[PDB]
């Protein structure tokens, strides 16, 4: 996260770290959506242009974390993966369309003050909240700058950007399964997700029921926090039918 701040304790209790077993290192962010299911970006697991193809046994999920590097004894919980499900129409060839994956845990994780699931949006909440200018929040342990790394989880609030501005910021073909967020050059304030924040949640707090909803997944961006560029996020509601289908069939 570039130009963010340290998270408060328990501020993002659905935040998950995807951790490589060997060598031991941060792979990506992710989010807890139930006691057994974790949501992330497909490109965290499968990206052939960079020879990335992780299987279940390569990774661990670490939940309840605040410190990036410490083993947070008596606070974090570490889970093994039973199975990975990548969207069947994930477009890694072109533009990362449908950049979404689910991971089923081997065993249910116990909820605590530091571990708690985020809500997935319904159509109405998505319609109400996914509007240009409305702000969401992104969290992660990724790079502090485009080209170092944070001691603890970082957070930044960013406004959703109008689709034509998103499109005009890039040569990539944008789809309805993506949205973008960030400040414009004229707006002064800045901030963005970065490498390592991939897969983490873009959340919004509903003013109707005071619950946090995951509207996006950190997906891609041209550099980090560049003027005139924006961060792109997987549109969670647009892919919710797939999410439900996987959970219904395999849960």
């Amino acid at each position: 996260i570039v130009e963010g701040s340290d998270a408060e304790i328990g501020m993002s209790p659905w935040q998950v770290m995807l951790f490589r077993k060997s060598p031991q290192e941060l792979l990506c962010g992710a989010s807890l959506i139930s006691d057994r299911w974790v949501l992330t970006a497909a490109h965290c697991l499968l990206y052939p242009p960079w020879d990335k193809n992780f299987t279940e046994n390569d990774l661990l999920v670490r939940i309840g974390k605040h410190s990036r590097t410490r083993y947070e004894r008596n606070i974090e919980k570490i889970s093994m993966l039973e199975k990975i499900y990548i969207h069947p129409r994930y477009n890694w060839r072109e533009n990362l369309d449908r950049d979404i994956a689910l991971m089923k845990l081997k065993k249910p994780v116990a909820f605590s003050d530091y571990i708690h699931p985020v809500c997935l949006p319904d159509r109405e909440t998505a319609a109400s909240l996914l509007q240009a200018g409305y702000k969401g929040r992104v969290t992660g342990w990724g790079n502090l700058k485009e080209t170092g790394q944070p001691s603890v989880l970082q957070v930044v609030n960013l406004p959703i950007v109008e689709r034509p501005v998103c499109k005009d910021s890039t040569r990539i073909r944008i789809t309805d399964n993506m949205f973008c967020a960030g400040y414009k050059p004229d707006e002064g304030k800045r901030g963005d997700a970065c490498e390592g924040d991939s897969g983490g949640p873009f959340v919004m707090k509903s003013p109707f029921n005071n619950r946090w909803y995951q509207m996006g997944i950190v997906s891609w961006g041209e550099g980090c926090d560049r003027d005139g560029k924006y961060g792109f996020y997987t549109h969670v509601f647009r892919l919710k039918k797939w999410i439900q289908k996987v959970i219904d069939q395999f849960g």
Binding site: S34, S112, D113, P117, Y134, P159, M204, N210, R211, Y213
Partner: peptide
């Protein structure tokens, strides 16, 4: 979950975090 999206250290105890108001203020 029925209790999804309500944080034990915040919503569940009616405490606000330091910047959530920034979000609310944008929901015009």
């Amino acid at each position: 979950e029925a209790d999804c999206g309500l944080r034990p250290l915040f919503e569940k105890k009616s405490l606000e975090d330091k910047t959530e108001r920034e979000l609310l203020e944008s929901y015009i």
